Amino acid sequence: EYIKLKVIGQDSSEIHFKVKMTTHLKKLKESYAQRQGVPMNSLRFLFEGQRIADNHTPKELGMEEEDVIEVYQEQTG
């Protein structure tokens, strides 16, 4: 039982991910970062403006089909 999530980057590009309700979102963050060629934790991934932790899952965050995750650069000093 998968849902599809839509990850939108700083340049408005999109990558979609098919995940289970039990998938640890670390897997999504790592995959996205790998495809951008940057370290995972150099980015911040937000769902409804709130930061996604490594061991969050779609179930824990109440995500549904076609929900959007936004990706921003990490904030700096």
């Binding site: 599809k4 999109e14 990558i15 979609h16 991910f17 098919k18 289970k20 897997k27 995959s31």
Partner: peptide, 8 residues
């Protein structure tokens, strides 16, 4: 850009 779906 083409559609990109990654299955985890």
């Amino acid at each position: 850009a083409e559609e990109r779906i990654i299955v985890l």
